[PDB]
Structure formats: structure tokens, C-alpha cells
Symmetry: D2
């Protein structure tokens, strides 16, 4: 469902839910009731983020409650990604390169799923650059090499040496960092955020 | 703060998919500075359509990039005095069926829609069904006697409910109410949640 | 059907972690036939403790292995006539503070607990706070005038609420009610949800 | 929180939630109020599944609402599994071996997470044995070899050939099956249910 069509349906649902007619809602938004009826006819495409915020406010809810879900990009419940159509971004932490991300398949039907194959380019644990923690949990598996993992308080972190084949779970918001085991050059991880 | 929340959630999501300003800007046909501006709270004029494209490219929903409803409570409470409650007519098939008197609501629990409903007609035969609504509903007969109908409107389940009676109607179940035959009118407290 | 639902959910979970009867039975110190029996609905006599070990070994909760509350509705509706509603005394510090008259409830929405509360004392000075409860609460003043207090009981927020007034109290917010000073008593409809 | 201690706390919470005293609840369960008080003092360990079902029933809720969550087996938000402490079960479908599962790390803090390294032993797509679909979504990545995937209606399935490095998402409940590409012998997958 497109933005304006989904909005049109949800706006009407919410308005009816709080027992308001077009007139009542219009009176709260500096518009005519005809303009409100138009939005419910799919003509709200040009409403600004600020205006949507006001619409959600007077209707006592959130913009999210008035907009459609991400959508369906599946083929009868499945979506596949071939190896060479894999995205690749440079993870630089502290003005120096840390990670080379190879993006795996993603889907609007499960937006939190962000799987990646990460090449860890540094092998100096003291170079470990902590992130702030992720929304969502994360499963990891050491694909190649040896990983020196750190987590928790960046000033007094927990640490573990993970050989190839090892797997780990890191809870949402837990800060963590990764590097190849001291002097081992480089390692590879498959990281699955979910 | 719609723009402030968007600014924050946009940066978070962009970071979740390991994209930098240039990466995201490209997919959107924008410059990296424009994207930086959005994350600096300058996204207020983006249209619903543009928000849709931004969410699409980020593989998520507009909702995931916008903040929650907000907090309109006073230390966890919001009260509403009588006579300051909204009042709208409920017309079905050109007939003043119900009179909706809106009670307190809060952005901290958007699905809560409590109302005092004046049930105007007292002829069950002329009951008008709604097609059921999303969300559960709790009802209490405040005054008079209610004649309720639910389910298949062609062969509905029914109940005569005196004052003090209470009912629960599950989401999506069609229902209708009128006062008991010849009792003139009745009143319900209906709490959608 | 507690055992039937368990039978089904146990098999599902066991299958999710790719275990066969023998694998699971080993970890539990049982024979594979005993485990097959559970999945054949013969788990009724398992104790809370044993259920805890089974969930542990399956890396999940007892809840994930037991069915939902159940459906006690008649085509989506459940009604309750007055005078068949539960009634329990609310004693705080050895004082009959409230009189709880229970309205309709349903296993299809367990958190819904609607009540008509008789507020017995009319001296705000002697208000007794609860420490806040889980879940939101909607209230409506049915009769009389209510003197409500909330928040920090040592320096609370307060409101005088006439009949028809409505209120929303967020989960975990401490609160107390008495009738307005010298009005004898009052009545509230309180809907926990 | 242990079973009986968690139950003790939740039972009391629920009983108070529906404004019942020990006596009222006992009257509905063939027990004395003293017995009910004992349960709330952590002595409900011997209650049977059937008895718990009745307790949940009269309290108008589920057994789940009266028992603690799975628990916390994390080390400051993380749990690691070394390669050689990896479980291994034989996935046999139709009286013949299909898969050899190598279980990766799991956690009670996210019970739906079941990651595995699966060795696909057959390379005859016609041997493909469909499952019934999983509760929960599933991310997959072809670790080695080539996979012949099938999904949807087992009688008229969608199919795709996936080379090494390919990734896929299969929505919960969507039936699917896997084999090595015709005559390629065998392949390997990392499957992450979540
Ligand atoms: C491997 C990955 O978790 C590094 P980060 O994306 O969490 O910073
Ligand atoms: C009483 C109330 O439930 C009627 P409707 O608002 O759902 O149409
Ligand atoms: C009126 C009601 O909220 C009092 P309590 O049941 O929460 O203690
Ligand atoms: C690889 C894995 O998905 C096969 P199944 O466990 O779903 O049957
Ligand atoms: Co991470
Ligand atoms: Co209704
Ligand atoms: Co309360
Ligand atoms: Co699968």
C-alpha cells in the first residue's frame, strides 16, 4: 500500500475511531472539510512531515499509526539475493578503516533483519572501536580467522577470543567491538541483526 | 519535534543498514548535505510521498522513522471534567441513532476511546449495525434498558440489558444497540481499547 | 486441553530446535516413550517444577509451551447481568476503604478488569495510596464527587472530580481516592486494561 | 526466576489484579485459603499441568501469564558458543537422511533464535522433502556448494538455484525444502531462525 493511499485509509479509520466527522477534524487543522475528504480520497501526498505531526496530534496518536507498514517485497513468502548483487560499504571508525560490509538479503516484511558478511581489516585489539549498541539483537558466526571480541563498558569491557566456527549472541543496546586476534591479520564474520 | 524525532530515527536506521550520508543520498537522488540536514532536524517540509521513498530505500516504514505519539499526562494522569467532553451525532442511513459524548483520551494510550452514548431510538426492529471495528470494546448500561444485537445481522444474537449490565465485544464483531422496545431512550458507557 | 495444547506446543518447540524424542528425553533423564506420551497428550500430571526443566532444556518459557487463555465468548460477545457481579471488600491498614463490584471479564482479553467501586470514606486526609499497578486504568465518576490523589504520596497531585468526570491513570502510577470532604460516599467505574 | 518462585509472584499479582482474596480463589479450586497462601510463598512446585490450567482458568487468563519468562543466560548481555561444543542431530525425512544439523548458540533471552549450519547430503531435487513451515522467519546463506531450493505448494512449488554466497529470507509458516543442485553432491547452509 502506497504512502498516500495507505494514509487515506488509516486517516479515515482513525477519524471514525474518535467519532469525528470531516468538519470537526478540519476545524483543528486550518483546512476545510472538503480538504480533509480529499486526503481520505488519497490526495494527501504533499502533506509535510510537520503537517502529518499535527494531524497525528489532534487525533491523539502517532504518524506511524496513520501510515502503512513497510510493504511486501516477497515472492510467495520468499526473497533471494544473488552473491554479486550484494551491497558493500566501508565501516570507518576513528578516521581509520575498520570493517568492509557485504550486505546480504533484506526484506520490508521484517525490517529489523540486517544480515552482513563483515571483513575485519585490523588485528590490533587496542584499535577496537566500540559502537553504541544496536536496536535489535545480533547473532554472529566466525566465518574465517580469529576474532577478538569486546563488549559492555568500553572503559572496562568483557573480552573473548573466538576461533573460526564460534557463534555469539549480543543483546540489543549492548555496546561491542570487533578485531582479528592480535597479529593474526584479518578475520571474517557473518553478522545477523534481527 | 516530528522533525526532531525523524532526524534521530533516520540517523539510527541509516546506521543500522550501514549507509553513510552519500550512500543514502544517491538512492534518493539528493546530495549528502541534504541528508545531513534532515538528520540535523531540517526535514520538516518533506512530503508524505518523499517520506515514503525514504522509508522504502531504508527497507522500513514511515512509522519506524517517526516518533511515538507523545506524552500529554501530568505525572501519569490526565483528567477531563464533564461539559468539556466532545459531542458528535451518530447518523446511520439518515437517522440520529446515537449521540457520542467523548470522555478523556491520551496519546500515551491512543486506542483508548471512552464515550457516554445516548441511545436515541427504542425500536429494536429498526436497529442499525456497524460492521464491527478494530479493537475490543467494554460497555456498561448507565441508564435505561438496552436491546443489543450482534453477529450476523440477518440472524443476530441478542440480549436485553438492564442498567448496571456490562458487556465485552471483541474486535471485528458487528453490533447494534437501541433502547428496549418502547422505553424511549437509554445510555451506555462504551470504552474502546 | 492444558495437556492437549502442551502436547502440541512441545512437539513444535522440540522440532524447532531439531531434537527427536531420544535427544530430548536424554536431557530430561526420561525415556523417549515418555516424551512421546507427552506429545500424545499424556502430560497432565507433570509438575510446575518439571515443566520448568522441560522449558529450560528447550531454551524457552513454560508459557511458550502452554496454550492461550481460551475463548469464553458467544459469537464474539460476553455479557454480565447486574447482581451476578463479584463483590469483595478493599481493606487498607484495617479500614474498609473500597467495595469492589466486579463487572464482566473475558479470557480473550485477560488484562480487562472493569469494576464499579464504592468509595466509602470521605476524608481526603485519610486517603490510602496503592503503590500503582501494572496496566492502564480508565475511570469515570458514576455518583457523588471524588477527591483523587496521585504521584508522590508525600506531595501528591490532586483533583476534585464531580459526577461525569473521567480520568486515565498510567501503569505504575500510585493513586488513592475518597469521596470529597464530608460528602459521605461516591462511586466510580474503574476499567483496568 | 525459578518456576515456583516466579509462579508465586505472578499468582499473587493476578489474584490481586482481579480483586480476589485467598478465600475467594481457594473456593474455586478445591483448596483451603492456607494452601493458596502457601503457593504464593513459593510452595506450588508440585502443582500439575492440569491443576495450573484450572488455576489460570478461574483467574481468567493463561498458564503463561502466571509463569516466569525463560530466563537470563547471558554474560552482561552476551553468550558465546565455541565450535566444538556445537550440538549435532540427524535430520531424516522419509526414512532417508536429508540434513546434518550443527547447532549454533542459543539464548533464553531470545528463544526464537535457532541458528544452525546444515550439511545438505542429497543432490537429487526430486528427493526434496518439504517441511510444514516454521513459526518464525528464517534467514539463510549458502556457505558451500549450490542449493536447489523449493517453496510454497509442495505440489506446485516455486524453485530457485542458489550458488555459494547467495542469501534468502523465508517468511514464517511458508513450507520449503532444500537439496544440493542436481548431481553436485552436497552443499552447506547457515540457517538462522528468528
Ligand atoms: C560486526 C558488527 O556487529 C559490527 P557493528 O555493526 O555492530 O558496529
Ligand atoms: C455503542 C458503540 O459500540 C456503537 P459503535 O461506535 O461501535 O458503532
Ligand atoms: C479505583 C482503583 O483504581 C483503586 P485500586 O484498585 O487500583 O487500588
Ligand atoms: C535449512 C532448514 O531450513 C531446513 P528445515 O529445518 O526448515 O526443514
Ligand atoms: Co553489532
Ligand atoms: Co462498538
Ligand atoms: Co487503580
Ligand atoms: Co527452514
Amino acid at each position: 500500500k502506497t504512502a498516500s493511499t495507505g494514509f487515506a485509509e488509516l486517516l479515515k479509520d482513525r477519524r471514525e475511531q474518535v467519532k469525528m466527522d470531516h468538519a470537526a477534524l478540519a476545524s483543528l487543522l486550518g483546512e476545510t472539510p472538503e480538504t480533509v475528504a480529499a486526503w481520505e480520497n488519497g490526495e494527501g501526498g504533499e502533506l509535510t512531515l510537520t503537517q502529518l505531526g499535527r494531524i497525528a496530534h489532534v487525533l491523539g496518536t502517532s504518524i506511524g499509526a496513520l501510515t502503512p507498514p513497510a510493504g511486501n517485497d516477497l515472492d510467495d513468502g520468499v526473497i533471494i539475493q544473488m552473491p554479486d548483487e550484494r551491497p558493500i560499504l566501508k565501516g570507518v571508525r576513528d578516521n581509520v578503516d575498520y570493517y568492509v560490509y557485504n550486505c546480504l538479503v533484506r526484506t520490508k516484511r521484517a525490517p529489523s533483519l540486517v544480515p552482513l558478511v563483515v571483513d575485519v581489516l585490523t588485528d590490533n585489539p587496542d584499535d577496537a572501536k566500540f559502537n553504541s549498541g544496536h536496536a535489535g539483537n545480533e547473532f554472529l558466526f566466525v566465518l574465517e580467522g580469529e576474532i577478538h571480541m569486546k563488549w559492555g563498558d568500553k572503559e572496562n569491557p568483557k573480552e573473548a577470543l573466538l576461533p573460526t566456527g564460534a557463534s555469539m549472541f549480543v543483546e540489543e543496546h549492548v555496546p561491542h567491538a570487533f578485531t582479528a586476534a592480535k597479529g593474526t591479520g584479518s578475520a571474517k564474520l557473518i553478522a545477523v541483526n534481527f
